[model samples]
Target: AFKGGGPYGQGVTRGQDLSGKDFSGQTLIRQDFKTSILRQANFKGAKLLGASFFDADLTGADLSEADLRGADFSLANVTKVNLTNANLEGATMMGNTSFKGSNITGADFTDVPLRDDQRVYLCKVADGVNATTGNATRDTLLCNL
Candidate 1:
């Protein structure tokens, strides 16, 4: 039970009200969630490679252990989200995005384009290595030694 994509080379997956939904362990590569209300949704262990969460309301969502490489989280409401152990390599959290109270332990943020404030704060609390990716959390975030 997994699907989402093209109707004439354009996906019909964008701008939906998918708040509080359960997407655990699903494969949703490059899916669009632009301007969607996805608050408090569950995305544990999901494969969201390169997905776009631009301008989406992802507050209080659980993305634990999700594969989110290259995902665009620009301008999303990601406050209070659970990103623990997620793989966020090359992902973006720029453009006024804020993730207050989110757990990032064991998560891989390699090459992630976080704001200066976010990078500083995250380095302070970053710890542990990713289980599946074999990348250290602090190392991935480029935390000071």
Candidate 2:
């Protein structure tokens, strides 16, 4: 298994099963973790800028306070994940990304696709300022009451 360290995606195969691993407080920029099983993995406070998690399984993952700007989470299962105080500015969350029961704040969802009803629900619950864009999370998603 790949332990916590820098510079992933070099000589490593794509789509690894790294479930329940502890990768907290690490810098893993632009890694290809697509279709990987990351269930209950701990990525708290990690710098995951531009990481591609498309079609990955991130169920119950602890992503609290992580930098997820420009990350691609398309078609991923993000159920029961902890995103409290996480920075998701410019991240791609389109396709079939399920974000149920996730704690969010100050995370930018600008340009991310969401249904009107879904947007309303998220707007009412989450609140905070974007870490990178410096824009209010509510405003960035145009969360209208």
Candidate 3:
């Protein structure tokens, strides 16, 4: 069982102002980023499987190609995030977790617990096919007219 920690020394980054930090290409599996200020943070190609991003401010963050399977993003601010080609299969985002203007092209959201409003909003603009999963964005997100 992973205890919200990874190869990174400080696995738990609760309520800290770590905005614009460069975390690209790092293996931060199961790390706890709860309530942390991660605005404009660069998480491109990072392995964040099972990580907890609850209540974290992730505005304008770069998360392209990240492995975010089973992550928790409840109540987090995900505005304008770059999630292209990322894998978020089985992730949880209960509550008001908005992805306003986030670039989710080719991203896999299989089994993500997205709210009705967010899903509806995403459906209007959902597009592209997942690079790894070979599934279209709209198909995986269950989007329909």
Candidate 4:
């Protein structure tokens, strides 16, 4: 849960490049980090419950095996972000982003813009049936308009 209501943590710096910063195994639930540069940040095995990143640059970020339940990435740049084996249940994303080899179960991408390449993965994951994983309980993947 957030401090009072909105998603923002204390001492979160702005205009600083968070490349290679290890955020694994930390709890950043619902923290609002808008327009921050997080290139190659390691969020693996982190618990991001309802966290959001508005227009943030996440290029080459390593987010493998992270727990992203209810997180919102609306208008964020996810180009080359490594989400392999990650759990994204009830997560939200906007705009065109590359998600190669990412396990996106129960993720709500209705608000996100889908590019031609993104659509391929979205449809492939969506058409899958009963794809079970230890990270999430959901079985279906969808990209909501």
Candidate 5:
């Protein structure tokens, strides 16, 4: 268990269970919520820039009009979750479940289940493959190794 502080200096962790929390319009930039259960949670219009939800469960969660720039949802099980008008520019996903009529754009979901290369990344796959390869463009990511 990694030690950390929340938005208000509260204790938090890597796999924080934030289910049923009403965080609408909150700013959760670059926070780690991996493998956390966020079912039926409210995230409408929330600013989740650079947040990592790797392997998190967001079934039936509300994320309409949320700002998800650079956020990673790799291997997350997000069934019937709302993502209307969400800004997912540079967001990654693999095998992430999604509703059929949900609105999305600028999001990459390549290599995910029930989606194609033309789809954006809203979650992750089970095999741990990077689902945002389609949006992995020049000047988008700066890698130095």
Candidate 6:
């Protein structure tokens, strides 16, 4: 039995299906959403700081203007997901992921273990500076030749 509530405190669920749920502008700090299905989920302007999403499927998810600082997106499917103006400082973004057309800013990718080619690829389209860290996305990704 999984409880779905807006602005809910920490939740622990794995391999569950929570697709297309609207969680906009909520405080979902420290929620364990690992290995879950969050395809097309709406998290616009939400405060998801420190949420763990390891191996989750978030394809086409809208996370614009969200506060995702310290969130773990390791091995998650983030294809075409919108992250415009999102605070991803210190977040883990690894594994075979695609961020095509997703709004990115300072989004501090620091400490995220990624290959040189992959980092370069993201830097090519990266834009904006981190709202918190004041670090440019390109500089953070080292987009220089």
Best by TM-score: 3
Candidate 6 has what TM-score? 0.82
lDDT tens per residue, model 5, 1-145: 0123237222352577878878788778886777888888788877888887889888888887677887887787767777655556767775644444443432333322234432333232111212333353211221111
The segments of candidate 5 whose C-alpha lies over 4 angstroms from its true place after superposition are: 1-13, 95-145
lDDT of 6 at 73: 90
- TM for every model, in the order presented, reads 0.87, 0.84, 0.91, 0.65, 0.64, 0.82
Report the candidate with higher TM-score, 3 versus 6. Answer: 3
Q: Compared with the true structure, what per-residue lDDT tens digits does model 4 show for residues 1-145?
A: 1223332344562445666676766677776656777877777666676777667777777666676666767667776676655666667666754455444443333223445566666667542222224422223333343
Candidate order by decreasing TM-score? 3, 1, 2, 6, 4, 5
Better of 2 and 6 by TM-score: 2
Error of 4 at 94 (Å): 2.4
The full ranking of all candidates by lDDT, starting with the best, is 3, 1, 2, 6, 5, 4
* Residue-wise C-alpha lDDT for candidate 1, range 1-145, written one tens digit per residue: 2234222112445787878877778777887888888888888998989999999999999999999999999999888888888999999988888777778889999889776798888887788888778899988888874
Candidate 1, run of 10 with poorest lDDT: 1-10
Global lDDT of model 1: 0.83
At residue 86, candidate 2 shows an lDDT of 79
The TM-score of candidate 3 is 0.91
- Identify the leading candidate in terms of lDDT: 3
Instruction: List, residue by residue over 12-73, the lDDT tens digit for candidate 2.
Output: 52587889988788787887888888999998988888988899999999988888889998
- Output the TM-score of candidate 4: 0.65
Q: Per-model C-alpha lDDT, please?
A: 0.83, 0.79, 0.86, 0.58, 0.59, 0.75
RMSD of each predicted structure: 2.9, 2.5, 4.0, 6.2, 9.4, 3.1
Model 3, which residues run further than 4 Å from truth? Answer: 1-6
Looking at candidate 3, what is the lDDT of residue 81? 98
